Structures are given as structure tokens and as C-alpha cells.
Design a protein around this nucleic acid. Structure first.
Length: 78
DNA sequence: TTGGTTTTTCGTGCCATAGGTTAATGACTTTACAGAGGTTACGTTTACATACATTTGTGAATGTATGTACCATGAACGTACCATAATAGAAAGA
């Protein structure tokens, strides 16, 4: 189920916008070693840090839809 | 008396005078594409107040730390079932 969840999250990040995928990977430590903080993401990508939170809120609003997470609703019990 | 060349009408074929539907480019006109201009509702960038965390001192839990000065003089301090046959070892008589 972990190996299937990896491919499922890879397909979800590939189905969305590529820059959204890079933010969601380098934010929580997906496909990286360390999880970068908000100041480190601000030093890497762009100075504005409130727009990063707006991007995160927009990504959560796009990922609350059941049609894009119907294969992930079965993984909710784990 | 019978076959075949000759000749003239007559409906049919060729030529000419009339008169009408319908090809031409166009001129259409209608639909489609191309031009700017005012308005909407976002998306990114910026400052500011308050919060969980994380960084410090301070009161209690244990823990090794060295000694106690009538006389204490050898034992296993209770273990245990005793199968079977290849290969060497330390001696004993040949």
C-alpha cells in the first residue's frame, strides 16, 4: 500500500500544475532529504512568503475535490 | 412474251428565314473576419498584531562514595544414571 501510495501521489502531482508539484514536493520533503522551512523556501524561490501560503491554500482547495481523490479515499482508513 | 434501261412523281432530306431558354463574365448582397475601446474581478506584493514553539534558571530523584574494631581458621554441602561401537593412548609380557 505504501508503494501504491507513492505512485498515486506521483500521478496526483503529475496531473496538477508543474510548479504546484515542485512546491508540494520541496515543501513537505517529498523527493528530498530535508523539509525546508518557510524562510528557506523564501530564500530559494521568491521573497514573498504570503503568496506561498496562498498557493498552499489554493492547492488544498484543488485537492479537496472527490473526483481527483477518489483513489485516495480508500487510503484514508490507514 | 419476258427482262431491263429510261423517266417522272413524291415523300423525304438539306438549306434558310424567324424567335425563345439559357450558358457568360460581372454587380450583387450577405455573412465572416479583422480593428480598437471601456469595464470586471481577480493575483501578486506589502505592513502589522498575536501565537506555538524553543531557550534559560530552580526545586526535587538517585548513587556511587569509604567504613563499622570480644571470638569466628580446608572441601565438594548435594549434583548422577550406569546406551553403543571406530580410533588412539600408557603399559605388559612375548
Amino acid at each position: 500500500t505504501t508503494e501504491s501510495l507513492r505512485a498515486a501521489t506521483h500521478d496526483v502531482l503529475a496531473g496538477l500544475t508543474a510548479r504546484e508539484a515542485k512546491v508540494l514536493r520541496m515543501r513537505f520533503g517529498i523527493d528530498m532529504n530535508t523539509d525546508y522551512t518557510l524562510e528557506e523556501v523564501g530564500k530559494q524561490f521568491d521573497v514573498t512568503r504570503e503568496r506561498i501560503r496562498q498557493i498552499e491554500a489554493k492547492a488544498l482547495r484543488k485537492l479537496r475535490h472527490p473526483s481527483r481523490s477518489e483513489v485516495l479515499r480508500s487510503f484514508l482508513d490507514d
